[PDB]
């Protein structure tokens, strides 16, 4: 996927403002579940790891590709479960 330097820079900054702003006025009670929920969303790494593994040529590459897909998957899955429980309020 082609993104130009500038196109990517704008994308980076815009989402950075967005991210920040969404959290501005949030009640204390919602901090940690929110900390949990964002923790979940980064679990999207798993997608990044999958694409790495599927392109890995050598045995070394295969081995640290496998390993990270586990880490990815645990992040999203564990992310999701805990945040849903935390969202019992």
């Amino acid at each position: 996927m082609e993104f130009g330097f500038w196109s990517a820079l704008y994308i980076f900054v815009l989402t950075a403002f967005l991210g920040y702003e969404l959290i501005t006025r949030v009640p204390v009670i919602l901090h940690t579940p929110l900390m949990s929920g964002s923790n979940f969303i980064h679990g999207v790494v798993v997608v990044g790891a999958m694409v790495v593994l599927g392109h890995a040529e050598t045995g070394l590459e295969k081995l640290i590709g496998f390993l990270g897909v586990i880490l990815g998957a645990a992040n999203a899955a564990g992310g999701y479960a805990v945040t849903v429980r935390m969202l019992e309020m």
Binding site: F3, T15, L18, Y20, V26, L34, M35, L71
Partner: protein
Amino acid sequence: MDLIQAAYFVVAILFIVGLKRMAHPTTAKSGIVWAGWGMVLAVLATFFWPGMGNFALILLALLLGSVVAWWAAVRVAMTDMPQMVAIYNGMGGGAAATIAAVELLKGAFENTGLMALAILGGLIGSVAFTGSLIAFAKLQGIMKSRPILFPGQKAVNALVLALTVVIGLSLLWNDATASIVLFFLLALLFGVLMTLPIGGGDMPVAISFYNAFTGMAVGFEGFAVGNPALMVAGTLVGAAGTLLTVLMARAMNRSVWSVL
């Protein structure tokens, strides 16, 4: 114009609203569900990634990770949410690093800026990785902790960080395997090192910090590889994580730096 692009486009919107909805009580339970859809759609869309071998091992990995993780989530009591968060966050970090590691080992980075973002992602994830594992073990009792001080630690830490960055930048001319091993060992060491002096009660703040970190970690990899799902969601969470870290520190009367 293609379909994984379309898929990720929707995935973004789905993460943005989720987060925003998680943002307000009146909409919160709504939030993760919305995110969940993003997660699903992103995973399922990427199975189509063209020229994708190792399909068997991808599936084994997805399955081992998700279910033990998922299982650990439900079986565990309700006052162990914090370390649960730490650990999943930890993994998130590691996940980041592995992307960086494999993409460097292949060698083929035809752009030095891209390569720098690879490495930068790499650094931050590992630090979060071990940082968050020391977070866990601390609250969990297995490392049982109050601030592990020793007379001149501030310097050795900053020094180790320095070294890491040096060997790091070195990769951008000469990317030899020896260097690559060194880089990660030193980063991994710093995550550990920089966590030690942090007290028991402070940990939440530390977790939010390393959360913000993993967020950036994922984003960096994203720009670096050219993956829109990573780019957006990584940077969305780094930002939000940063502000949120502040707000938690400022809510405990403390100040982040006091914490670290």
